[PDB]
Amino acid sequence: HICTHAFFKAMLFMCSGSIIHSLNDEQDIRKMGGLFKAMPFTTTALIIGSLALTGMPFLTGFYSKDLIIESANTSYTNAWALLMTLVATSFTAIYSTRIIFFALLGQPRFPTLININENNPFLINSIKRLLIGSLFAGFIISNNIPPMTIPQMTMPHYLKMTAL
Amino acid sequence: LTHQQKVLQLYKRALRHLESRCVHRDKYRYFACLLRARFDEHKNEKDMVKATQLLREAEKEFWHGQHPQPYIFPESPGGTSYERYECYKVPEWCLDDWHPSEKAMYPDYFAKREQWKKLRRESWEREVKQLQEETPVGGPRTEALPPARKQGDLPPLWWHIVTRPR
Amino acid sequence: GKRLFIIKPSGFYDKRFLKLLRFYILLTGIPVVIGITLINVFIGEAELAEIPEGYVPEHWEYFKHPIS
Amino acid sequence: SDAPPLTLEGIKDRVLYVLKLYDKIDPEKLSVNSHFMKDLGLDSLDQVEIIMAMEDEFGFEIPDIDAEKLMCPQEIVDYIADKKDVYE
Amino acid sequence: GGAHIEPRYRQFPQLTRSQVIQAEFFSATMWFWILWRFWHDSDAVLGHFPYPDPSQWTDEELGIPP
Amino acid sequence: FGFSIVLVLGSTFVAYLPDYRMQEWARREAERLVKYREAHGLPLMESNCFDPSKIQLPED
Amino acid sequence: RHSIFAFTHVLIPVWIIHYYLKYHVTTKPYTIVEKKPRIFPGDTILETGEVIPP
Amino acid sequence: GFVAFMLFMFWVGETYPTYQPVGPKQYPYNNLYLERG
Amino acid sequence: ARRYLGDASVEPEPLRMPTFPPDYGFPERKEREMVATQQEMNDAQLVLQQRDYCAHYLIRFLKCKRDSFPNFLACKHEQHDWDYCEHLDYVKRMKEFERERRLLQRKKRREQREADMA
Amino acid sequence: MNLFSSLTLVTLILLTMPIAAINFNTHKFTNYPLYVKTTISCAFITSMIPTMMFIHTGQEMIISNWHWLTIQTLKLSLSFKMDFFSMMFVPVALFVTWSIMEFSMWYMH
Amino acid sequence: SWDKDVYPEPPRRTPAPSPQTSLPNPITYLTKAFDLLVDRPVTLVREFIERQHAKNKYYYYHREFRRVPDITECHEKDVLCMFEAEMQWKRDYKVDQEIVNIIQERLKACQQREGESHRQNCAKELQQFTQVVKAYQDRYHDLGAHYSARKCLAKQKQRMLAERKATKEAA
Amino acid sequence: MLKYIIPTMMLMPLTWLSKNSMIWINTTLHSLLISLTSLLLLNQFGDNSLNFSLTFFSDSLSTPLLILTMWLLPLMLMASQHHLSKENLARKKLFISMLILLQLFLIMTFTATELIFFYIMFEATLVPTLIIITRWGNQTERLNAGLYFLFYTLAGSLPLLVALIYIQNTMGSLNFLILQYWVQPMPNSWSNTFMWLACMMAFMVKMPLYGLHLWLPKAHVEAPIAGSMVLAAILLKLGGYGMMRITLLLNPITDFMAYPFIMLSLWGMIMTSSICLRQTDLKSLIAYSSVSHMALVIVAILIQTPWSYMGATALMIAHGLTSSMLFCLANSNYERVHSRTMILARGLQTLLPLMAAWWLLASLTNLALPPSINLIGELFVVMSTFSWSNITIILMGLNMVITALYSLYMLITTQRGKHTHHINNILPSFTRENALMSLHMLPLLLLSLNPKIILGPLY
Amino acid sequence: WRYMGGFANNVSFVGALLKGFKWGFAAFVVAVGAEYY
Amino acid sequence: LDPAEYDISSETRKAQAERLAIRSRLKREYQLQYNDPSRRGVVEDPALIRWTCARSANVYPNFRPNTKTSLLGALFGIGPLIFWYYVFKTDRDRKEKLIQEGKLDRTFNISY
């Protein structure tokens, strides 16, 4: 989960800079604007990275976080940590909902005179390689992990169906 | 300090906190309009004490309307800039000494710069005369800098020609 | 504008001192490095064996390296 | 980069532009010299509004003390002109 | 320098065709992948968690207390 | 004299000077002695820095 | 050729360092100590007797 | 919240499947006898 | 955990496991299933608590990784094989949960009340 | 097996740059930041080989190089510990920093 | 070419490569190519340096130190004998230091070799470790900054007496 | 050793007879040429401390400290110029003469076998320093802080002579070699009380323990930069040094007698480390820093574990170069604007962009950065003191955090945050400044490779 | 102005998670065509 | 902190505070405001010299009359300090005990 997290949040910052510097720089979630305004690729990075860091539906980091809450969801945990896991990951998802419902949602409201530019091989190549890797990196890390223990893998109802 | 800037300040930063409140800017609009009426009924009375009273009431009622992270445009003191570039500001008295080689690196700058050195070396006597003349005893009352009547420079100029922001 | 005139503290004294410092540290660096290389190459370091019978070993040569 | 500077033509077109978007007074008389109050008699509270939304046009600075006394449009252009970096 | 970035005031920021080409392409990548292996995966992966019906195993019944 | 001779020259001197504090010799001697101690079966490192075979003890 | 010159920029470290280890490892008793390679009963002698479940 | 936890510290959640019917029920140590037949 | 063995074997720890069987030992009805040689079990080094029965499968999976290296997928089948065997095993400890819970209810209740009759 | 000696190469592949950032004092003006970036990638592939070697045969070899002083009963040298924690991590670090450095070439221009 | 039985190298026990599936050869292209690129181009150089060394040999000797009466035969004062005794005591001391280093390194290399087996095959070497380090622990351990012989001999007096009372209570 | 005693004594008339304008050249030159042979001094080997002559010898510790001294003269003298660079020739030759003679008595002191020769040469070391800082110290009111400073020394520093001579006629020889092997245990009682306390407090006045630390700050703000690098790079290490040796005897006594002083140094380490955080006037910060590290040293001396010495001596040397240099930074900043007050000017990342690297580098070397010798010594000392008391690490590591905070606070607000722009004087750098800084750090960073030179006799 | 333009059509959320579904699970639809033919 | 009460400023406080305050201020603003050419060195302002000299503790050497002072200082270095004396001596002696008797379970300790 450290490796995967590195990919995902590195993506998220390295896009957020595209937002900021592209905007001049306000870097406040107020103002901001909608998703697609000459910003296709950065916003794509933001629902790859956002949708990613949500805990993933089935995507890469899922190979970390979901397994984590499965095993931690079970056995001898003092059990104050289970609810902790649940509402924790949930409020992570709601962070994502925040940054979409503000930065990506409403029609543009912010200091006028659009200066925005996405055109430059440096960014597109950067975020490019990081996302191409990200979705395919967590999958290599997935089943190349020489087995170090017994996975739960027998997961009861209501202790299984609560991750997603 | 006068009623003018008191009221007007409360109005202005009230609009600021209100900006920070809402979103999509339209709700901000007609709310700000209800406020526009809230101060619009005001101001038509020259009664003295009643006014400052009601104002103070708007000082508490305003102080309720402060959420802790009011929006701050970047350039003023705030979490965005307030001299991000400050390590880049080098005062013009530096470069007064570079090596004469590098002083020859850019041969024509110091030409005009020398026209400034003479501009304000020829000066400052005209300046000191005009100032020592105008100032009332001690110069207590004025923080301002009144101009020069004769053709020429405005006397306390030197620092006011500044290294610019980036 | 087209090209603004930048203001830097100065370039001459820093760069100068560095050029000098490198010049000298290298000036006796190179002969010494070359030396360690040579006596590392042509002359062998050393080899052990052991104290011969009824033999007086000298002061030095209890030590491996020749520069020792 | 953040390439484009605000030049005199530009800022003129801007203060001029938004003041032409102000509805309650008409584009009829708008000029850098055209008086920002005495001509239009606008509320001083309303000039506080003008400087408000114009600051939100250019997004910076404009302290309250200096914002108080601004008035005429050419002057506003001037304040933005020395505060920003403008002249050739 | 100028890339034909076209700094614009008040209209929709101009956009490079190839860019939305890229972004859309990677949308297709994300969901193509995700429902792809969602057809290659399972969210209940093995035999189901057990049930008390064998908790009878009534043969086990106590010997001495009939 | 400051940068050239003492820094570079001296730094090569004390870089490798003869074995300092003898600890290299300590390694060699340790190797030989340990090998002997196993090969002849004696337990190595017997404690007792001096043989109780020769010593005397005060008495109450 | 330029990229092969940068490939030299990486390759000279391979020469030196690898040389440093070619004489180095032998010169000193303990270093480069590696986990004993994983051995399987597939190699040597295998004992299973397995089949099933389906 | 913390001291509430340390009240949860001596108490526990358990493994499987579910919890707190409790009479003097088992807990992991596997306890009495052993027999089948 | 079938026997106490002894510490005179000079072996603390995995040469002394709880016993050579990792978990319980099943005096119960009959024995414990088959075996995996401890020597092989070491010479393919297996983390403790990764080391149980079903290793018949596991060690074959560790084959399948180095079987075809460049293949990432390799065997999903043997993966599912020790997945299945230890599925069934964890389910067995479920059945032990069952056996003991019901023994509690039965002998507790019956013997308490029918002991408290007189 | 000594390709893990190439693993202790890659660290010096990173070591290379600051030496360039000091000694020559001119061609750095030629846009070395590009050069740093290239060094990072070289470290990424040259760092990628050992991961593959491990994930077939394992074989993690720790190296002590030349020892750091001695003192009393404990001779502490230095090491490079191939745990599969290092093996797996370092390509990630070099990779993410590859990204962030190219992006930075865009950010700080 | 260090002395072998001092620093054990167990059997190498290298497994036999089985392809087991037909695919590309991802590392082996580069293990052969590496052994083409980085093996010989260095090997020639090391060998040339070898012959260059070998044309002129050196002989350097490991020093010896004879023995002396040590602390016993010295009188309460008159340092002239003492100096020898106590300084060579210091030598033998440092020797014991390096013994402790040797054992302590054997343990480390032992765990690294075993792998996940940590408690399997290091039992013997860890055992002799506790033996030696308990010896050193008993003898030199607590004395202080200023220590020569008088203090080691002293502590040995202390243990001999404490164990003589311990062995009268053995009755 | 005598081969090191002549060349400086010959370095005196080299100064006195010379043409004007060449004095700095001649002195610097031949003084570095001395430093070479100072580096020759390391033969030290095996067990027996080398003995040059029956009058004076060298063990390890004397050798690192001595090398540091003979290295430190040319850099010192090199630094002192342009503090004046205008005067009659007699002032110059007098000053250089005084630095020389001071070095001579220092070499006497470190090399001295027999403790009375050590003591005579001891106060004979103190006088030249006094003449330096008082005769021209920039003299803020002069404070008379040289003279009754010498009274802070002698006040309780004289009776150690008494105690010595007692040791003399009771045991005969005061030769250190034979004081060793003849040392005999001294029980805990009231006579051994006044004795142990005599010797201890006698040296403890020099490295200031928190009780007496008022000694340093004034004396070190009034010192001309040469007298400063003299003072805090060396003259404390004399006290700690002699302490190292005379603790040979006092064997059981130092436990029951040690404990209060240890307490006072463990608390005063934190206190001093605190007060040095909040002050203005930069020249003091590094002073109280010296007080802190020296308190740590005393802590290391009293607890007698060998680790304690290894870390101790390592801290003597590393703190010598670090503190010395950092002073010389304060001075190089002082010639620019005449203040001594820290907060007055600021910036100097913009301006003097190189002098940054030396500020940063040196401050980090006082920040206890892991490879730096300062962290080697401080680290081993923390190990020893944790061995002594499992509890004391709260205080120790708390000193870690505070020393971090001020050591990195000095790095800022002198060097960063804005240019005060009413300055318009500072002239960019010099080559000499870079020479001084370099000659400080470069060896301090190289020693971080092969430290086994500077670790103590026990190794 | 902040309303009128190519703006003001905008998107409602879950449209962001509907951004590229058409081509994406289009190629998903075809995807199994490899093993089914 | 928390501007409040919105003071009516009265009349004197208006005239006095305003005129006198900004009087002295503008006097000193214009004073250091000269900023001519030909000054090479610092502007030297007598401000902050008072700061430095006073913060050099001018009343430190003279005396400390009792009042509450000796109580604040003595009790300021009293409670924590001497108690730490007692705790390090305590844990000291305990350590010595568990060494000399029973076991501290040091086993291998060595470098110490």
What whole-number distance in Å separates Cα of residue I13 and Cα of residue I24?
A: 16
Tokens of B4: 């003018």
Q: Number of folded domains in chain L?
A: 1
Query: Beta-carbon neighbour count of residue F30 at 10 Å?
Result: 21
- Does H have 3 or more CB contacts under 8 Å with C? no
- N57-73 burial string, b = 16+ CB within 10 Å, else e? eeeeeeeeeeeeeeeee
D12-22: b or e for each residue (b if 16 or more CB lie within 10 Å)?
bebbbebbeeb
Looking up tokens 């110091």, which residue turns up? B110
* CB contact J21 to I (< 8 Å): no
| Residues, chain E | 66
User: Which residues from D are below 8 Å from A115, CB to CB?
Assistant: 2-4
* E-strand stretches of L211-308: none
Please name the residues between 33 and 72 in chain J that touch chain N, using a CB distance below 8 Å.
71-72
DSSP tag of M32: G
Partners of G34 in the beta sheet? J61
| Structure-derived torsion over alpha carbons of residues H8, H14, H20, H21, reported in degrees to the nearest 10 | -160
∠ Cα G39 G42 G46 (to 5°):
110
Q: Is the peptide bond before G53 cis (omega within 30 degrees of 0)?
A: yes
Q: Which amino acid does the sequence have at N66?
A: N
DSSP letter assigned to residue J28: G
Q: How many angstroms separate the Cα of J16 from the Cα of each of A63, G17, L350?
A: 36, 13, 28
* Contact criterion met (CB below 8 Å) for I51 and I41: yes
K108-111 long-range contacts (CB < 8 A, ≥24 apart) are K108/G30, K109/G30, K109/G33, K109/K7
Q: Other C-beta atoms within 10 Å of L329: how many?
A: 23
All residues of chain J having their beta carbon less than 8 Å from the beta carbon of residue A133 are: 95
K131: amino acid identity, one letter: Q
Among the listed residues A141, A144, A164, A148, the one whose alpha carbon sits nearest the alpha carbon of residue A7: A141
Q: Are I54 and I82 in contact (CB under 8 A)?
A: yes
Amino acid symbol at K89: W
Please give the Cα distance from L204 to L199 (Å, whole number): 8
Rounded Cα gap, residues J20 and B111, in angstroms: 38
Report the largest interatomic distance among the alpha carbons of chain J, rounded to a whole angstrom: 53
List J63's β-bridge partners, or say none. J80
Cα distance between residue L306 and residue K142, in whole Å: 10
Maximal CA-CA distance, chain L: 69
Taking CB atoms and an 8 Å cutoff, what residues of chain A touch B80? Answer: 25-28
Question: What angle, 0 to 180 degrees and rounded to 10, lies between the N-to-C axes of helices E17-39 and A121-143?
Answer: 10
Nearest chain L alpha carbon to B93: L424
Please tell me the distance from the alpha carbon of residue K139 to that of residue K155, in angstroms, as a whole number. 8
Helix (H, G, I), strand (E, B) or coil at L360: helix
DSSP calls for F2-44 = IIIIIIIIIHHHTTS-SPSTTHHHHHHHHHHHHHHHHHT-PPS
CA distance A150 to N31: 81
L392, L269 contact by CB (below 8 A): no
In this structure, the number of other CB atoms found within 10 A of the CB of residue K121 comes to 18
Q: Which of L26, L37, L42 to mutate to test the interface with F (most CBs of F within 10 A)?
A: L42
Q: Whole-angstrom Cα distance, residue L219 to residue L134?
A: 9
Name the residue among I10, I12, I45 with its Cβ closest to that of K115: I45
Whole-angstrom Cα distance, residue B131 to residue B147?
10
Tell me how far apart the alpha carbons of residues B20 and B41 are, in angstroms, rounded to a whole number. Answer: 25
Determination technique for this entry: cryo-EM
Active site residue D43: yes
DSSP per residue over A128-162, as a string? HHHHHHHHHHHHHHHH-S---S-------TTTSS-
Rounded CA separation L45/K94 (Å): 12
DSSP at J62: E
Partners of A35 on chain M (C-beta within 8 Å) are 11, 16
| Neighbours, chain A (3 or more CB pairs < 8 A) | B, D, E, H, I, J, M
Give the separation between CA D48 and CA D37, rounded to whole angstroms.
Answer: 12
Q: How far is CA I3 from CA B84, I8, I13, K98, in A?
A: 73, 14, 15, 44
Nearest to K21 by CA among E58, L281, L2, I67: I67
Apex CA N110: angle with CA N109 and CA N112, to 5°? Answer: 85
Euclidean distance between CA atoms C61 and C47, whole angstroms? 10
Question: Is residue J80 classed as helix, strand or coil in its secondary structure?
Answer: strand
- Residue K35 CA to residue H16 CA, distance in Å, equals 56
* Selection from L138, L173, L249, L157 nearest residue L212 by Cα: L157
Among the listed residues B64, B80, B166, M16, the one whose alpha carbon sits nearest the alpha carbon of residue A30: B80
- Chain-centroid distance of CA B112 in Å reads 30
Asked whether the beta carbons of J51 and C41 are under 8 A apart, the reply is: no
Ordered DSSP codes for L381-399: HHHHHHHH-SSTHHHHHHH
Instruction: Calculate how close chain B gets to L258, using CA atoms only, in Å.
Output: 52
Cα dihedral value J52, J54, J60, J66, nearest 10: -10
Helices A40-53, E17-39: axis angle to 10 degrees equals 30
Structure tokens, D30? 């708008």
**Cα–Cα dist F36/K95, whole Å:** 14
Nearest CA among G44, L442, G38, L228 for reference residue F11? L442
* DSSP 8-state assignment for residue I48: B
End-to-end CA distance of chain I: 41
Helices L306-334, L431-446: inter-axial angle, 10-degree rounding: 170
CB count in 10 Å sphere of residue L258: 20
Domain that holds residue L392: 1-459
Give the CA angle between residues J85, J91, J92 to the nearest 5°: 85
User: Does residue B152 contact residue B123 with C-beta atoms inside 8 Å?
Assistant: yes
Minimum Cα–Cα distance from J24: chain C residue? C19
The interaxial angle of helices B3-21 and B26-40, nearest 10 deg, is: 160
- Residue J62 φ/ψ, nearest 5 degrees: -90, 140
As a three-state string, the secondary structure of chain C is: CCCCCCCCCCCHHHHHHHHHHHHHHHHCHHHHHHHHHHHHHCCCCCCCCCCCCCCCCCCCCCCCCCCC
Which of B56, B121, B140 is nearest residue N23 as measured by Cβ atoms?
Answer: B140
Helix (H) / strand (E) element for G33: namely: strand G33-34
Structure tokens at L321: 């170069």
Whether L340 contacts L283, CB under 8 Å: yes
Q: Report yes or no: C20 and L431 within 8 Å, Cβ to Cβ.
A: yes
* H/E segment holding residue A84: helix A80-103
Strand partners of residue I48? I51
Q: How far apart are CA I82 and CA I53, in angstroms?
A: 10
| Contacting residues for N58 by C-beta, under 8 A, at least 6 apart | none
What's the token pair of residue N93? 């002696």
| Identity of the residue in I83, I91, I107 whose CB atom sits nearest the CB atom of E62 | I107
Count CB-CB contacts under 10 A for residue L433: 23
Quickly list DSSP for N44-72.
--STTHHHHHHHTTTTTTT----TTHHHH
- Rounded Cα distance, D34 and H37, in Å: 109
Residue I31 backbone dihedrals phi, psi, to 5 degrees: 45, -145
Distance from CA of residue B139 to its chain's centroid? 23
Cα-based torsion angle of the residue sequence L237, L242, L248, L249 in order, rounded to the nearest 10 degrees: -140
DSSP annotation of L29? H
Q: How far does CA K124 lie from the centroid of its chain?
A: 16
- G48 to chain K, closest Cα gap in Å: 19
- Calculate the alpha carbon distances from L433 to B96, L25, L439 in Å: 21, 16, 10
Residue B60 and residue B10 in contact, taking contact as beta carbons nearer than 8 Å:
no
Q: Residue L160 is inside which H or E element, if any?
A: helix L159-171
Among partner residues K56, K61, K64, which is closest to C44 by beta-carbon distance? K56
Distance, in Å, from the CA atom of L429 to the CA atom of L358, rounded to the nearest integer, reads: 12
What is the CB neighbour count within 10 angstroms for residue A102?
17
Q: Which of L315, L71, L329 is closest to F7 using CA atoms?
A: L71
- Say which DSSP state A108 is in: P
Cα–Cα nearest to L238, from L170, L177, L160: L160
- SS3 string, B23-85, reads CCCHHHHHHHHHHHHHHHCCCCCCCCHHHHHHHHHHHHHHHCCCCCCCCCCCCCCCCCCCCCC
Can you spell out the DSSP letters for I9-45?
Answer: GS--STTS-SSSSSS----SSS-------HHHHHHTT
H6 forms bridges with which residues in the sheet?
none
Q: Which amino acid would we find at residue F52?
A: P
Helix (H, G, I), strand (E, B) or coil at J63: strand
